[PDB]
Design a protein around this ligand. Structure first.
Ligand code: 3R9
Ligand code: K
Ligand code: ZN
Ligand code: ZN
Length: 222
């Protein structure tokens, strides 16, 4: 049930479990309100985000909300690809001394698109631990973008799909200009192969689902 919104209503967080919430922000795309998801991980060494938000204003507001609520600092963010939706708050992170993890390719792409660079520290498979919280990052191949990664929480069997994974409500692939529609199916299969028992799947946009969201993505690719 538990859902907390900000003043203006533009930001929301909703609990999945004792230490794991989804954050969602309404941003401005072409040309309506469009929601974007990530994760807030409440660990004993601080707050870790899987993705920040659309722009600096929303990222600052997000950080401020979870800092106030959980009474600890945001220490780390995992940036799941280099579109503005994911990388847009990078300047806020760097200036606050928040570590912005990404693959090298995501870092390269950010800079090519004129953003400040995340760390480029993540390999194809990276295993991180913050306090007691275990976090795996996985590059499954190209799909929604060249660089898109997923994030797995092995203690909860929770998969952050990012924009690689479409919600039920999504009835097409979205913007495919940066996409690789042949390789996207294989990428999704690589996820299904690596993570055989999944409790919950967080799509880049839309409502939390399960493994069925990955199967939905495959169908939308046919
Ligand atoms: O993931 C997507 O398909 C689209 C629809 S909403 C958001 C803004 S365009 C792209 C950047 S992640 N993304
Ligand atoms: K454990
Ligand atoms: Zn994207
Ligand atoms: Zn997206």
């Amino acid at each position: 049930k538990t859902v907390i919104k900000n003043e203006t209503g533009t930001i929301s967080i909703s609990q999945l479990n004792k230490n794991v919430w989804v954050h969602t922000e309404l941003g401005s795309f072409n040309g309506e309100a469009v929601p974007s998801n990530g994760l807030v991980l409440n660990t004993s060494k601080g707050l870790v985000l899987v993705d920040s938000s659309w722009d600096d204003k929303l990222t600052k507001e997000l950080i401020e909300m979870v800092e106030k609520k959980f009474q600890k600092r945001v220490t780390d963010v995992i940036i799941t690809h280099a579109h503005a939706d994911r990388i847009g708050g990078i300047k806020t992170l760097k200036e606050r001394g928040i570590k912005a993890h990404s693959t090298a390719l995501t870092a390269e792409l950010a800079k090519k698109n004129g953003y400040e660079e995340p760390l480029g520290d993540l390999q194809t498979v990276t295993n991180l631990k913050f306090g007691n919280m275990k976090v795996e990052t996985f590059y499954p191949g190209k799909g929604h973008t060249e660089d898109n990664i997923v994030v797995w929480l092995p203690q909860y069997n929770i998969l952050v799909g990012g924009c690689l994974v479409k919600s039920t409500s999504a009835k097409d692939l979205g913007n495919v200009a940066d996409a690789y529609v042949n390789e996207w199916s294989t990428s999704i299969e690589n996820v299904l192969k690596r993570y055989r028992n999944i409790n919950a799947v967080v799509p880049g946009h839309g409502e939390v689902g399960d493994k069925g969201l990955l199967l939905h993505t495959l169908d939308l690719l046919k």
